[PDB]
RNA sequence: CCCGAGAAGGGAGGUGCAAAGUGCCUGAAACCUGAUAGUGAUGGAACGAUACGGCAUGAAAGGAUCUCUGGCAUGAAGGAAUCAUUCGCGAGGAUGUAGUACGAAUGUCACUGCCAGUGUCGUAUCUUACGUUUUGAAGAACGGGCCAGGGAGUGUAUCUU
RNA sequence: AGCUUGUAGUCCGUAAGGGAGACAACCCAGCCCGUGGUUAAGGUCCCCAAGUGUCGACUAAGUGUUAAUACUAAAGGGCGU
RNA sequence: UGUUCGGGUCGAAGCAGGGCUGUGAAGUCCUGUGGACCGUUCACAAACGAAAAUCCUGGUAAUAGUAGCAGCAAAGCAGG
RNA sequence: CCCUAACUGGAGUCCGGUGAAGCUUACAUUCUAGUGCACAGUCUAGAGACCUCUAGGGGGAAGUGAAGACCCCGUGGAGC
RNA sequence: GGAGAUCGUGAGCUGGGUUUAGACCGUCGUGAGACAGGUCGGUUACUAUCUACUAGAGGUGCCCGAGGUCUGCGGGUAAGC
């Protein structure tokens, strides 16, 4: 519904954070993309996410494996989370902008915290058979992202 | 229950029916030597099939002497290079590689398979293997060979296929000295197999993908009213109530084809040297034309065109010397008509 | 290093099992095919052919064929091998057929009480013959 | 003020003792995400009880003759080893040494700075969950997906003790 | 008939711990907590603490290595010993 | 509730973890958060204690990023 | 049907977006035999078992749906 | 040949019979109705969580780092009858 306290706080001297507030994206795929992009630099993470959206590089799905085949190269089951890639790209862009506004250098930032949190769910209905309506939700996700020029 | 009895669907002799672990068939056993020294194996590539009209020479056959049309299989078999000489030490556990010596001179195309061994320990490795044979540690000597498919235009590859071919001689010193003679050279298929003699053809068969139980084991389709109730190409039952588990012997889907298979008593009918003798008009379909020296094998052979075929002299050949064939007509008309 | 030539299979196995459960020594049992099993040859071969062709192919007991692996199996039976003590004891045991090359010139000790001449009958077969009649090569 | 297409949202920044930051007081568990400790791709299951160890913690609320390691005094039940004699076919027994040396614990003197505890893992022994119907339940008998809250001997009249 | 219906005693139900491989009721045992000791039942080749224990015989069949028992085959025969 | 003795913005209740006492029900204490009430002696009352009723209401999983988004009218492509 | 084969369109398989539900005390990589209320993945003794993922059809979970509608009982009903 | 596998096998199929509601024939019953009598007709629900099997992959374990060629602890066969 509203603003979120961060799970992790980097030190404010070398911290450029940015929250993706309650995106309507898939929490499983966004969680996998956040697990992949943690530890990378901002530039290489942006390049990887752009390759993900262009279907050239696949993220490895290790926790939510079902309904996903095995991708080429040295990889297990992996997919191309287009919507998660776009939303995490927007959060990464906002984090780079905050690093610019703080005088910090976005070109050396290492993503030290990048996690998802499920937000409030917009309850829906799906008209099923035999006069029954099961739910169908628009699950929201809060995307945290912390940069820092230290590692 | 008055049981109706049917033989089991498919063979359990070839399980687990998995994808074979190499494009080259491997020989698990070799026949015992019965004469002068020679390589027991050769490797070729399957081109395609044609038919010959050969006078029948098979003794005691119903159609002996009269004309017959025998479906043959032309095989493109260029020279092979005996790369290495490897000796084995036998013990309680089993045969173990005790030493090898590679030929000094080798083809430049071999780098696509393995890095080229240097021309180093040639005389000294040979004297080491001689001392090992003398003291008694050595039991058998085998030769390493590779194809040289750079000449063949119907096979897209140019990397050699490396394989072991046992030498056929009587005394291990005799085997060692013959292997010394043929080490590092090019030996044509006429120096291994003679015209009219049986062989064994092994090769990875035609892959058919993940096929179903009706095609993989030849199980029965559901019949009559059961043909259109929702399960037509599915096995009727996977097991009883007890034991509470599916047996490994139930027919099921899986990898069909691309297995290694050995065919026995495949006769040799012709030892040719020009591909225009057998190449039909328009070439072979999806292959091209024959450009090296070939051998015509009677009947079918496992694998599609272009596949590597390993030829060894027979291990369970029932019949005696068969003599030279008399081909009257190699049918080189078009395969596309 | 135990020389198992002319020794009872069970008595040697029990002695080696207690020695390994003492818990310090790596025990090599050379000449495993020359171990003795008392009883008539027909009954011995009947029991061992029944035990050989017992299990299922996906689950069942894959009882070995080699004499050294059969002696290892028999010593495995008299250990708590599913425990860490048993696992360490089975890792500290090596059985060979004949004399391996690294045990040439080594010193051996044979169990007195597990001797085969303590028996008082001609009814015995060697473990090597049972392994050979189970189809083994050794 | 910056990013954002944006009256969305985010960062920086400020009001406020405190964001308590628009169904906004405190803000549990289930459930979800991340980090730390232990273990982990040779491994056996009512998830725990008891004892002993490895790793991490042990600031407060717990100990300071408390923790670790020894000597000395008194030591209930029990009670050697070794040696000698004699018996016994023998394994061994009896007698003496000797109710000796030892022995739970109770005191005292040195010695030491950890110990109690907490989390996880391993080793040894024991346990096939809970309630119910049952002669008999781990039952292939019935009830429970999980967590929170609500949920079952109360009043009048009358008799008896 | 692990069937049905009685009677005497003792059990389970309502009974731990120790031992029979597991065992409602079979043996020791009826049990507040901690420590030490010695025994009960049963066992001592290994799994498993303690006997490759002693004496005198038997068995050659892997018989057997199964106190009670719902868990263990008879009649008959053997110049087997 | 009557009655005695009290604690609290120098921080009450509640909440998460932990130490100590008690055979135990539970009590008390400490760390963190909190922003206004809370206990105790001697007695007395009750809409007085949950682990369970295919219990009731709410929140939320695993299934699962799975089934469906196909069958009766298979409809879209180029340029701007 | 002997005896199945090839081909077409829609599903399925793979990919992008959207996106539920039903079983569920717990644990769970099993297989054999015994025992146990006499039909055990969890007990006892053995034998196997490196883990994770995808596809497959349904052997087992006395699979799920459901206070059995057959039989009996109830000093229970209704209709005739 | 016979027999076992929950008279193996309906989350595989079928639905012919038996065992629902309708109706007819015969026999019972005053009757409603009944027949271990016959006849005609009569709904087969589920998206597979765990396990087992069948195939296909990703890892770690072993290991100078990598590649290639082999061995054979084992598993399977009816590969023939
Ligand atoms: Mg969504
Ligand atoms: Mg409707
Ligand atoms: Mg009762
Ligand atoms: Mg409550
Ligand atoms: Mg009694
Ligand atoms: Mg009693
Ligand atoms: Mg008892
Ligand atoms: Mg409750
Ligand atoms: Mg589609
Ligand atoms: Mg009922
Ligand atoms: Mg009555
Ligand atoms: Mg079934």
UniProtKB/Swiss-Prot annotation, chain A:
GO cellular component assignments: cytosolic large ribosomal subunit
Lineage in the entry? Archaea, Methanobacteriati, Methanobacteriota, Stenosarchaea group, Methanomicrobia
Q: Where is the composition biased (Polar residues)?
A: 1-18
* Swiss-Prot/TrEMBL keywords: Ribonucleoprotein, Ribosomal protein, RNA-binding, rRNA-binding
- The answer on whether this UniProt entry bears the keyword Ribonucleoprotein reads yes
Instruction: State the species of origin.
Output: Methanosarcina acetivorans (strain ATCC 35395 / DSM 2834 / JCM 12185 / C2A)
CDD domains reported in the protein's UniProt record: Ribosomal_L22
Name the Gene3D superfamilies on file: Ribosomal protein L22/L17 (3.90.470.10)
The answer to keyword RNA-binding applying to this record is yes
Q: What is this protein called?
A: Large ribosomal subunit protein uL22
Gene symbol here is rpl22
Describe its assembly: Part of the 50S ribosomal subunit.
Annotated GO biological process: cytoplasmic translation
Entry's family note = Belongs to the universal ribosomal protein uL22 family.
Q: What is the purpose of this protein?
A: This protein binds specifically to 23S rRNA. It makes multiple contacts with different domains of the 23S rRNA in the assembled 50S subunit and ribosome. The globular domain of the protein is located near the polypeptide exit tunnel on the outside of the subunit, while an extended beta-hairpin is found that lines the wall of the exit tunnel in the center of the 70S ribosome.
Pfam families this protein is in?
Ribosomal_L22 (PF00237)
The record ties this protein, via InterPro entries, to:
Ribosomal_uL22 (IPR001063), Ribosomal_uL22_euk/arc (IPR005721), Ribosomal_uL22_sf (IPR036394)
Q: Which GO terms describe its molecular function?
A: rRNA binding; structural constituent of ribosome
UniProtKB/Swiss-Prot annotation, chain B:
Which molecular function terms from Gene Ontology are attached? RNA binding; rRNA binding; structural constituent of ribosome
Q: Does the keyword Acyltransferase apply?
A: no
Q: Which domain of life is it from?
A: Archaea
Query: Which of UniProt's keywords are assigned here?
Result: Ribonucleoprotein, Ribosomal protein, RNA-binding, rRNA-binding
Q: How does it assemble?
A: Part of the 50S ribosomal subunit. Forms a cluster with proteins L14 and L24e.
The job of this chain, per UniProt, is described as: One of the primary rRNA binding proteins, it binds directly near the 3'-end of the 23S rRNA, where it nucleates assembly of the 50S subunit.
Task: Report the sequence similarity comment from the record.
Answer: Belongs to the universal ribosomal protein uL3 family.
Q: What is this protein called?
A: Large ribosomal subunit protein uL3
Instruction: Please tell me the species this chain comes from.
Output: Methanosarcina acetivorans (strain ATCC 35395 / DSM 2834 / JCM 12185 / C2A)
Q: What gene makes this protein?
A: rpl3
From Swiss-Prot, chain C:
**Similarity section:** Belongs to the universal ribosomal protein uL13 family.
Q: Which PROSITE patterns match?
A: RIBOSOMAL_L13 (PS00783)
Out of the domains of life, which is the source? Archaea
An individual GO BP term: negative regulation of translation
Span of the signal peptide: none
> What is the protein name for this chain?
Large ribosomal subunit protein uL13
Gene3D superfamilies the UniProt entry points to? Ribosomal protein L13
**Listed GO CC annotations:** cytosolic large ribosomal subunit; ribosome
Q: Which GO terms describe its molecular function?
A: mRNA binding; structural constituent of ribosome
Pfam families for this protein: Ribosomal_L13
Which species? Methanosarcina acetivorans (strain ATCC 35395 / DSM 2834 / JCM 12185 / C2A)
Role played: This protein is one of the early assembly proteins of the 50S ribosomal subunit, although it is not seen to bind rRNA by itself. It is important during the early stages of 50S assembly.
Keyword Signal tagged: no
Known partners and oligomeric status: Part of the 50S ribosomal subunit.
Keywords, A to Z? Answer: Ribonucleoprotein, Ribosomal protein
Note the InterPro entries from the entry: Ribosomal_uL13, Ribosomal_uL13_bac-type, Ribosomal_uL13_CS, Ribosomal_uL13_euk/arc, Ribosomal_uL13_sf
**SUPFAM superfamilies referenced in this protein's UniProt entry, alphabetically:** Ribosomal protein L13
* PANTHER family noted in UniProt: LARGE RIBOSOMAL SUBUNIT PROTEIN UL13 (PTHR11545:SF3), RIBOSOMAL PROTEIN L13 (PTHR11545)
